[PDB]
Amino acid sequence: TLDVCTKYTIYGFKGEGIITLTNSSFLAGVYYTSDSGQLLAFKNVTSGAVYSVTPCSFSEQAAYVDDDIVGVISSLSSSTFNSTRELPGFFYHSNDGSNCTEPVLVYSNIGVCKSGSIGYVPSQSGQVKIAPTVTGNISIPTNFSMSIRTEYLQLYNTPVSVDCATYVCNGNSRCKQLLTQYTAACKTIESALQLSAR
Amino acid sequence: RTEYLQLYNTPVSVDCATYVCNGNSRCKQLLTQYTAACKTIESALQLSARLESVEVNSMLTISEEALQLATISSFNGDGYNFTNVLGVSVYDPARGRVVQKRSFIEDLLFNKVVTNGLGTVDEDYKRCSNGRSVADLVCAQYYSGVMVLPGVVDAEKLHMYSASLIGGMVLGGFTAAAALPFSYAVQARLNYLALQTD
Amino acid sequence: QKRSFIEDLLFNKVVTNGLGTVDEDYKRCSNGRSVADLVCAQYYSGVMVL
Amino acid sequence: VDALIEVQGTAIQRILYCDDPVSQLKCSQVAFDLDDGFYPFSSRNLLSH
Amino acid sequence: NFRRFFSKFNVQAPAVVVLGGYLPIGENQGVNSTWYCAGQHPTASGVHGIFVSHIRGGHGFEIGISQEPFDPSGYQLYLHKATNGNTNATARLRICQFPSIKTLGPTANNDVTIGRNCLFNKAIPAHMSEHSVVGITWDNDRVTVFSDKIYYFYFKNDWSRVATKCYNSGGCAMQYVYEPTYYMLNVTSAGEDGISYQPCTANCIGYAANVFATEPNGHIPEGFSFNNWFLLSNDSTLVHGKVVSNQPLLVNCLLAIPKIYGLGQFFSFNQTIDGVCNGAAVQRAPEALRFNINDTSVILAEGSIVLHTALGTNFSF
Amino acid sequence: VLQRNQQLLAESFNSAIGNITSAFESVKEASSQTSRGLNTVAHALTKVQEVVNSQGAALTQLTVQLQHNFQAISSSIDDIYSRLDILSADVQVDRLITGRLSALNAFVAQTLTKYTEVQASRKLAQQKVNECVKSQSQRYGFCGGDGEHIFSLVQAAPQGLLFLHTVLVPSDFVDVIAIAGLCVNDEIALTLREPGLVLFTHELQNHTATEYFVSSRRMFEPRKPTVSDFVQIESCVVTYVNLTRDQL
Amino acid sequence: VVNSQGAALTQLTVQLQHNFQAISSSIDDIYSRLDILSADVQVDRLITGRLSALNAFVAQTLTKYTEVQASRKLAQQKVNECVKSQSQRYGFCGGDGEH
Ligand SMILES: *[C@@H]1O[C@H](CO[C@@H]2O[C@@H](C)[C@@H](O)[C@@H](O)[C@@H]2O)[C@@H](O[C@@H]2O[C@H](CO)[C@@H](O[C@@H]3O[C@H](CO[C@H]4O[C@H](CO)[C@@H](O)[C@H](O)[C@@H]4O)[C@@H](O)[C@H](O[C@H]4O[C@H](CO)[C@@H](O)[C@H](O)[C@@H]4O)[C@@H]3O)[C@H](O)[C@H]2NC(C)=O)[C@H](O)[C@H]1NC(C)=O
Ligand SMILES: *[C@@H]1O[C@H](CO)[C@@H](O[C@@H]2O[C@H](CO)[C@@H](O[C@@H]3O[C@H](CO[C@H]4O[C@H](CO)[C@@H](O)[C@H](O)[C@@H]4O)[C@@H](O)[C@H](O[C@H]4O[C@H](CO)[C@@H](O)[C@H](O)[C@@H]4O)[C@@H]3O)[C@H](O)[C@H]2NC(C)=O)[C@H](O)[C@H]1NC(C)=O
Ligand SMILES: *[C@@H]1O[C@H](CO)[C@@H](O[C@@H]2O[C@H](CO)[C@@H](O[C@@H]3O[C@H](CO[C@H]4O[C@H](CO)[C@@H](O)[C@H](O)[C@@H]4O)[C@@H](O)[C@H](O[C@H]4O[C@H](CO)[C@@H](O)[C@H](O)[C@@H]4O)[C@@H]3O)[C@H](O)[C@H]2NC(C)=O)[C@H](O)[C@H]1NC(C)=O
Ligand SMILES: *[C@@H]1O[C@H](CO)[C@@H](O[C@@H]2O[C@H](CO)[C@@H](O[C@@H]3O[C@H](CO[C@H]4O[C@H](CO)[C@@H](O)[C@H](O)[C@@H]4O)[C@@H](O)[C@H](O[C@H]4O[C@H](CO)[C@@H](O)[C@H](O)[C@@H]4O)[C@@H]3O)[C@H](O)[C@H]2NC(C)=O)[C@H](O)[C@H]1NC(C)=O
Ligand SMILES: *[C@@H]1O[C@H](CO)[C@@H](O[C@@H]2O[C@H](CO)[C@@H](O[C@@H]3O[C@H](CO[C@H]4O[C@H](CO)[C@@H](O)[C@H](O)[C@@H]4O)[C@@H](O)[C@H](O[C@H]4O[C@H](CO)[C@@H](O)[C@H](O)[C@@H]4O)[C@@H]3O)[C@H](O)[C@H]2NC(C)=O)[C@H](O)[C@H]1NC(C)=O
Ligand SMILES: *[C@@H]1O[C@H](CO)[C@@H](O[C@@H]2O[C@H](CO)[C@@H](O[C@@H]3O[C@H](CO[C@H]4O[C@H](CO)[C@@H](O)[C@H](O)[C@@H]4O)[C@@H](O)[C@H](O[C@H]4O[C@H](CO)[C@@H](O)[C@H](O)[C@@H]4O)[C@@H]3O)[C@H](O)[C@H]2NC(C)=O)[C@H](O)[C@H]1NC(C)=O
Ligand SMILES: *[C@@H]1O[C@H](CO[C@@H]2O[C@@H](C)[C@@H](O)[C@@H](O)[C@@H]2O)[C@@H](O[C@@H]2O[C@H](CO)[C@@H](O[C@@H]3O[C@H](CO)[C@@H](O)[C@H](O)[C@@H]3O)[C@H](O)[C@H]2NC(C)=O)[C@H](O)[C@H]1NC(C)=O
Ligand SMILES: *[C@@H]1O[C@H](CO)[C@@H](O[C@@H]2O[C@H](CO)[C@@H](O[C@@H]3O[C@H](CO)[C@@H](O)[C@H](O)[C@@H]3O)[C@H](O)[C@H]2NC(C)=O)[C@H](O)[C@H]1NC(C)=O
Ligand SMILES: *[C@@H]1O[C@H](CO)[C@@H](O[C@@H]2O[C@H](CO)[C@@H](O[C@@H]3O[C@H](CO)[C@@H](O)[C@H](O)[C@@H]3O)[C@H](O)[C@H]2NC(C)=O)[C@H](O)[C@H]1NC(C)=O
Ligand SMILES: *[C@@H]1O[C@H](CO)[C@@H](O[C@@H]2O[C@H](CO)[C@@H](O[C@@H]3O[C@H](CO)[C@@H](O)[C@H](O)[C@@H]3O)[C@H](O)[C@H]2NC(C)=O)[C@H](O)[C@H]1NC(C)=O
Ligand SMILES: *[C@@H]1O[C@H](CO[C@@H]2O[C@@H](C)[C@@H](O)[C@@H](O)[C@@H]2O)[C@@H](O)[C@H](O)[C@H]1NC(C)=O
Ligand SMILES: *[C@@H]1O[C@H](CO)[C@@H](O)[C@H](O)[C@H]1NC(C)=O
Ligand SMILES: *[C@@H]1O[C@H](CO)[C@@H](O)[C@H](O)[C@H]1NC(C)=O
Ligand SMILES: *[C@@H]1O[C@H](CO)[C@@H](O)[C@H](O)[C@H]1NC(C)=O
């Protein structure tokens, strides 16, 4: 079956997908696979018919709003939403096709308002600094105000200790004498943690 | 002298269930036993993206005034050239407004070392969403359930960012009538570093 | 002298008593006498955060 | 059927289903209330058996 | 009066359930004590449930509920309702630890234990009618609101002192109830009017704790205790936690207080079980059957339980 | 020395305290990105939230690995011990002990890795308090950025320390006329010495009133100059204003 | 470094190609061969391996992100002192000379 979502069973490669025609040309080779090992495009001998299959499933990026979904981002024009606008690189899906003015959720140069409208965020105005001048004129600042800015930093981390034997031996006696063969890892950890703690 | 430092990194997006299940109802209900790890990883990547995104937005600043003075015509040429370094002023494109491309120097290093056709030129996923022809790994890894987040900023933004920052040093008063000669500020710095007599 | 305004406010809002931050008495685990949460268990596992 | 379960002190309450891509993620996040933002989701294609 | 009060809740047409709660009896049926907290035999605990729909000024409704034992690290509630109309009746409801004072306003030292942002902050629409009151009740971790649809919320704290910055109303203008009375509610009319709201006398707790309404989607109506309901586990035990799993909770039909099994009643996984499918009806073959227990003596005495295998082998309990 | 200007800044400080106090609680009321960017409580609470979530980790997985049975009959050593002879169980326990030890070696390495990076990070923050707090920085924007520091109230939070940078803020800009320099008798060039200060003339010669003062370039504190404040040069250029001895 | 960043994603599909102790990696097909029991064993194997791989992935990725946040902290530092301004710290930016 062609160009429909169907149960494909091909040369010991089975599954569900949609097949598509392609016009490639190669005098040799009949099947061509992906890095993962799945086969996308292939040809058949007698007619050289080359076909590419596609999964009957794809991903998308949807936005959670307040307590619901209002915006969806996909690659297919069709959607359950009223409107779908083809923005560069993707389809935006929503029932609100208006213009975003006070974005509530912003990613990259893009942002979305509460109503769901999307928009391009203009760059925020930066602080202005006046360079020195030899002569002529200057706009000397005056009439100053206050602004307090925030900063934090976490300083120290609590240490922890473990006894490998107890952690691995829950009371057995034969265990330790058997495991006498190799213990140096326990040594490395204890010394390291102890010196680190101190 | 020369220095360089990289700024940010390309994010990645993956869905655990799809990555593990290629449309498998039994498998998803099977794997329902363990999911907390998926929650942790998605949260990490999602929270990350947000945190680096806002800080770079805070990193950037704008000054249209420096953009005014950016062009050679808007600079009082004094012996010095700054030709291949100063950004080129391009015509009005379909946008209808005069915009700016990259100067000679960075375009040189880009077209030499930065290979065109790599991940930098972001791919619109529609082309393989229709498919219809043999594609490269990127849609297959999308098929794997992987998508590469678009760059948070743009080279032009940084281009005029760098241009604005560098051009900010020719300012005098608020909206100066003419840019002070670069040499003038030079002896300003020269006397600052050591008052000149001759 | 107790805490000032802001830090105690932020302490209580971000951290609730009984979290990993609060100190613990190890005597009850030795006694047992009741249901045990994790904290005695990982002690039984042999791990100890100082 | 499948649903999210909350047990507290050998008591059970606030049991919610998953018959919704919104609800599926909700139980995929085991939180009654999620956080607004971007979350990637596949194409639900159980339309035809 | 009570017809409009209880008609707001939605339910399938064939329903009869016993309901218990602090139902109103009089406009200003005065309390028999002067206590606001709850303890042993808690009846005159103040206002377990208040219900007001009248105002002498009409400006609006301000409501503040807290606990006088002063546990400031807890949560407080304010309701700001615009007494104008029905769509305008939308009230700003805020469940958050409030920067409030025992005095209803800023005239003394403030309680500032508001570390947490909020537990709820939204505006809920309401409506006006002479026989449509708006009110609030509390019972253990249960909080129920008679305003449009019932609002039930779960949290662990104590609330004992009620007050309002708008007292411009008479005593009869608000109904304050403090004793949980029991009434069996029967509706089969397929309309806003139920058959009766007759008081319930016996088996009320069992009937309330076990009888519910089968939804068209077969989902569980809220507020049900599930007192004798337990996680389906083939092993292990969990005192507390959260999980998603597969459980036999979808319903095809519902029966209660059977009276016919003593005559050799038969059931099969094929046939949809007949009887009064209390609530909605599902034309789905049963996948399992759950049974409530009151007195095993009947089962012990004459409970004749015999099961059959695919090979005809039988086992008799 | 009007004693009022610093008072005017005082209620600005007090009003700022109110907003800062307000912003501490319920950040999500009417938050804005301009109020959520860098040096914002939201950014600050972001940092504190992520670190507390960060520290609340790296222990549960430890319980996870020990729970597993890897390539063995059962995780109960005594069971097989009671249910089997010595040699076969020995093989499995070797596997099992190797599994646990390998996991914890990876664990201890990553933990000490956090330890190494935080040692460096802890060092850096140590200076920050020294300069910005213990002393007065002359750097432009070192403590925070893009401002002129006044002081900073430093406090703590669970297992860390925090900065609130009290910084002066410019609002107005005085537009004044600058003078290139002075030359007198075409012999003496009266010139500046300290670059921070600058000579200037408030107003112009429109009505024979040219107010020659000197003040800092950065700050607007006009005042009359003095000869000793300047320096003399024996060479002159067109940039110097011509004056006579009587005008000195 | 651009060549460096042009890596660390190819290996993912590699073990995805690789089969963790099973007849065949094709989960759907192998599911379509025999009863449920054995298949459940192997599917756990593969999911554990891939999740562990991405757990590794997360560690070094956040590691790069941790080291780089310090890096551009220093970088934003740089754009302040002698970029937006001039200082007297000799050779602080540049070194071996007076800026
Ligand atoms: C009692 O159970 C009946 C079957 O259920 C099982 O058996 C009983 C004994 C219990 O143990 C129970 O627990 C078991 O699960 C149940 O029967 C239902 O209704 C009809 C019965 O005739 C059946 O549905 C039929 O479907 C086919 C289509 O299916 C395929 O059929 C062939 C198979 O090779 C294919 O070639 C087709 O392409 C289809 O893919 C219909 O064709 C069929 O139409 C006619 O079938 C018979 C043939 O003699 C006629 O007599 C009927 O009148 C129909 O006109 C049926 O539609 C099937 O057994 C079952 N189906 C469903 C959907 O449940 C019965 O309903 C149960 N009774 C009660 C009261 O619960
Ligand atoms: C998109 O797809 C769906 C179906 O596939 C449809 O979308 C709906 O379209 C209708 C009509 O176009 C929209 O109805 C609008 O509702 C608004 C919300 O008001 C609510 O609250 C008021 C009380 O304040 C109620 O009276 C009202 O019934 C609503 O419950 C109204 O504001 C709209 O107009 C009314 O209000 C304005 C301003 O107050 C007045 O000026 C008007 O006279 C009128 O009274 C309108 O009634 C509905 O919201 C849409 N739903 C969506 C988008 O999800 C459409 O078929 C299709 N296309 C569009 C464009 O929606
Ligand atoms: C909740 O509310 C519902 C709604 O009223 C109550 O249902 C009523 O129950 C009473 C008590 O049995 C019914 O009264 C008797 O009904 C018998 C059955 O006929 C009714 O039911 C069938 C099936 O539902 C309907 O199709 C039919 O139209 C009838 O409505 C009658 O046979 C009885 O009459 C017999 O006795 C009298 C003498 O007493 C003779 O004169 C008659 O000829 C006849 O022999 C009697 O009428 C009542 O009909 C039910 N209502 C309805 C609408 O059917 C629930 O009982 C109530 N439950 C609780 C707990 O409150
Ligand atoms: C505790 O431990 C027990 C013991 O394993 C677990 O019990 C398992 O429960 C699941 C859930 O239903 C069972 O899975 C079901 O297996 C059925 C097997 O039927 C086949 O095998 C018999 C012979 O045994 C054949 O005669 C028969 O014809 C079948 O070939 C399936 O039929 C079930 O199918 C499900 O999916 C289909 C869709 O394909 C649906 O249409 C069905 O309605 C149904 O949902 C299902 O796969 C499993 O078999 C049980 N184990 C055993 C050993 O039987 C418990 O789950 C576990 N946990 C708890 C909490 O108790
Ligand atoms: C830096 O700081 C100095 C000292 O304050 C400022 O000098 C002040 O300049 C401002 C205007 O820039 C003056 O503010 C206004 O003054 C009004 C009356 O004063 C003069 O107003 C005009 C000026 O255009 C003259 O023509 C007139 O003859 C007066 O002599 C007041 O009525 C104003 O108050 C109203 O506006 C303010 C601001 O909106 C409100 O806050 C008030 O509540 C009220 O509504 C206003 O105060 C001020 O008089 C000057 N002060 C002195 C002592 O002279 C500098 O101007 C300033 N640098 C700047 C702004 O660049
Ligand atoms: C900052 O740096 C500048 C440049 O070194 C110093 O000089 C100022 O320079 C600006 C522009 O370079 C001057 O702005 C000018 O305004 C003037 C306005 O016309 C005056 O003269 C006519 C004729 O006498 C009068 O009729 C009229 O009323 C005004 O009194 C013009 O010279 C310029 O605009 C004219 O020409 C343009 C172009 O042809 C036309 O479009 C205009 O309509 C207008 O006709 C020019 O815009 C500024 O005036 C200069 N300063 C002074 C004091 O004059 C500054 O001194 C320096 N700042 C300080 C504080 O020192
Ligand atoms: C927001 O609303 C605008 C309304 O259209 C116009 O928007 C402004 C440009 C103003 O001129 C308004 O007065 C006017 O009504 C919707 O239309 C589109 O707006 C964009 C925004 O700039 C226009 O920009 C174009 O951008 C491309 C690429 O940069 C250029 O090539 C174009 O020359 C032009 O600059 C665009 O012309 C305009 N019309 C379209 C796209 O048909 C806009 O859709 C809406 N946005 C959202 C998110 O709803
Ligand atoms: C400022 O820089 C520009 C850009 O380089 C200079 O203009 C151009 O300079 C290049 C080389 O500096 C000239 O290239 C010439 O090409 C011919 C033919 O290949 C070759 O024979 C010459 O030896 C030289 O390489 C180019 O002609 C020249 N073009 C123009 C229009 O100037 C400019 O000279 C610089 N000016 C200053 C003041 O620095
Ligand atoms: C410096 O900050 C402290 C702390 O807020 C200020 O003390 C506060 O002063 C206000 C104003 O008097 C007090 O408000 C009071 O409100 C109640 C109602 O809640 C009212 O009845 C009172 O008449 C009064 O207005 C507030 O309680 C008080 N708080 C504390 C902790 O002292 C102080 O005023 C500030 N400094 C200056 C100079 O204002
Ligand atoms: C203040 O005193 C100085 C000291 O002499 C004066 O400088 C002199 O100014 C004249 C007039 O501009 C200069 O003559 C010029 O010569 C150039 C060629 O060098 C010519 O192109 C011009 O057209 C003009 O004729 C002279 O060189 C210059 N000398 C020095 C030593 O600076 C200055 O002019 C006096 N101020 C005023 C306002 O006149
Ligand atoms: C498919 O054919 C292309 C030739 O042009 C196309 O012809 C048909 C198939 C339509 O798709 C039409 O829109 C085009 O103009 C080749 O360029 C292309 O390489 C062929 N595909 C492959 C895989 O070789
Ligand atoms: C709703 O009520 C508020 C307060 O009672 C009032 O301010 C507002 O104007 C009212 N709106 C309408 C549409 O009546
Ligand atoms: C034994 O059980 C029967 C049936 O439940 C019960 O009626 C009877 O009381 C019991 N025997 C005695 C001696 O009580
Ligand atoms: C916060 O700042 C605004 C100006 O942006 C001011 O109007 C307001 O009074 C300040 N808040 C307090 C509590 O001082």
Short mmCIF file of C-alpha atoms in Angstrom, two decimals, chain A residues 124 127-130 132-160 164 167-170 172-175 178-179 181-182 185 188-189 192 196-197, chain F residues 9 12-13 16 20 34 39-41 44 47-48 51 66 77 81 90 100 115 118 122 125 145-146 148 157-180 217-220:
data_model
loop_
_atom_site.label_atom_id
_atom_site.label_comp_id
_atom_site.label_asym_id
_atom_site.label_seq_id
_atom_site.Cartn_x
_atom_site.Cartn_y
_atom_site.Cartn_z
CA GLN A 124 15.89 45.51 26.40
CA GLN A 127 22.45 51.17 30.90
CA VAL A 128 23.96 54.36 29.51
CA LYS A 129 27.53 55.40 30.28
CA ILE A 130 29.15 58.64 29.12
CA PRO A 132 35.16 61.29 28.75
CA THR A 133 35.78 64.17 26.36
CA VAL A 134 38.68 66.52 25.66
CA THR A 135 36.60 69.72 25.50
CA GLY A 136 33.33 71.13 24.20
CA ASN A 137 30.39 69.67 26.10
CA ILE A 138 29.49 67.00 28.63
CA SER A 139 26.34 65.69 30.33
CA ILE A 140 27.52 65.39 33.93
CA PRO A 141 25.18 63.26 36.07
CA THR A 142 23.42 64.67 39.12
CA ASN A 143 20.44 64.05 41.38
CA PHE A 144 21.18 60.46 42.16
CA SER A 145 19.03 57.68 43.58
CA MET A 146 19.24 54.20 45.10
CA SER A 147 19.19 50.70 43.66
CA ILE A 148 20.00 47.49 45.50
CA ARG A 149 21.00 44.38 43.59
CA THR A 150 20.94 40.75 44.64
CA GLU A 151 23.72 38.22 45.09
CA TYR A 152 24.13 34.84 46.79
CA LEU A 153 26.68 32.06 46.99
CA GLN A 154 26.69 28.68 48.74
CA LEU A 155 29.98 28.09 50.53
CA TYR A 156 30.46 24.67 52.13
CA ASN A 157 29.07 21.18 51.61
CA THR A 158 28.36 18.68 54.34
CA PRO A 159 30.52 15.53 54.22
CA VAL A 160 29.32 11.95 54.58
CA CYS A 164 32.02 -0.36 52.87
CA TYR A 167 27.35 -1.44 53.78
CA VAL A 168 28.19 -4.64 51.94
CA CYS A 169 28.36 -7.10 54.85
CA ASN A 170 25.16 -7.19 56.87
CA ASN A 172 28.22 -12.14 58.03
CA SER A 173 31.56 -13.40 59.32
CA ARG A 174 32.61 -15.58 56.40
CA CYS A 175 32.15 -12.63 54.08
CA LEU A 178 36.43 -14.34 51.90
CA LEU A 179 36.61 -10.74 50.71
CA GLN A 181 41.23 -10.71 48.57
CA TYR A 182 40.54 -7.07 47.63
CA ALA A 185 39.12 0.66 47.33
CA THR A 188 41.02 5.14 49.02
CA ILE A 189 37.53 6.33 49.92
CA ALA A 192 39.93 10.78 50.83
CA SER A 196 38.47 16.18 52.75
CA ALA A 197 36.40 16.50 55.91
CA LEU F 9 18.28 59.89 49.18
CA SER F 12 14.64 56.65 48.38
CA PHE F 13 16.53 54.08 50.42
CA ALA F 16 13.59 50.78 48.12
CA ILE F 20 12.73 44.85 48.51
CA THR F 34 13.02 43.52 34.12
CA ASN F 39 20.61 41.06 40.34
CA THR F 40 16.95 40.36 41.03
CA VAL F 41 15.40 38.50 43.92
CA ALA F 44 18.41 35.16 43.57
CA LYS F 47 19.83 30.36 42.61
CA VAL F 48 18.85 29.47 46.16
CA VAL F 51 21.15 24.85 45.08
CA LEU F 66 22.28 -1.62 46.64
CA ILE F 77 23.39 -13.52 50.45
CA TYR F 81 24.41 -19.16 51.63
CA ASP F 90 31.44 -16.90 45.96
CA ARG F 100 28.73 -1.98 44.60
CA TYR F 115 34.34 19.38 46.21
CA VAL F 118 33.39 24.40 45.09
CA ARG F 122 34.38 29.18 47.71
CA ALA F 125 33.39 34.38 47.03
CA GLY F 145 27.98 45.82 37.73
CA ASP F 146 27.12 49.11 36.00
CA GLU F 148 28.67 53.29 41.72
CA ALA F 157 21.03 31.62 53.92
CA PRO F 158 21.14 27.87 54.53
CA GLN F 159 24.75 26.92 54.01
CA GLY F 160 25.63 30.11 52.08
CA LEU F 161 26.14 33.88 52.10
CA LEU F 162 24.38 36.56 50.08
CA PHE F 163 24.97 40.13 48.91
CA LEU F 164 22.57 43.06 48.55
CA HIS F 165 24.48 45.87 46.84
CA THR F 166 23.39 49.36 47.88
CA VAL F 167 24.36 51.47 44.88
CA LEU F 168 23.89 55.10 43.91
CA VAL F 169 21.92 55.70 40.73
CA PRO F 170 22.16 58.53 38.18
CA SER F 171 18.96 60.17 37.07
CA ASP F 172 19.80 63.63 35.69
CA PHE F 173 22.55 64.91 33.39
CA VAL F 174 24.04 68.40 33.62
CA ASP F 175 24.89 69.85 30.21
CA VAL F 176 27.84 72.23 30.56
CA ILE F 177 30.38 73.88 28.29
CA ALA F 178 33.94 72.58 28.32
CA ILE F 179 37.10 74.63 27.92
CA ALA F 180 40.11 73.26 26.07
CA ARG F 217 34.08 65.00 35.04
CA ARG F 218 32.10 62.20 36.65
CA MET F 219 30.30 64.28 39.29
CA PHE F 220 28.69 67.72 39.17
#
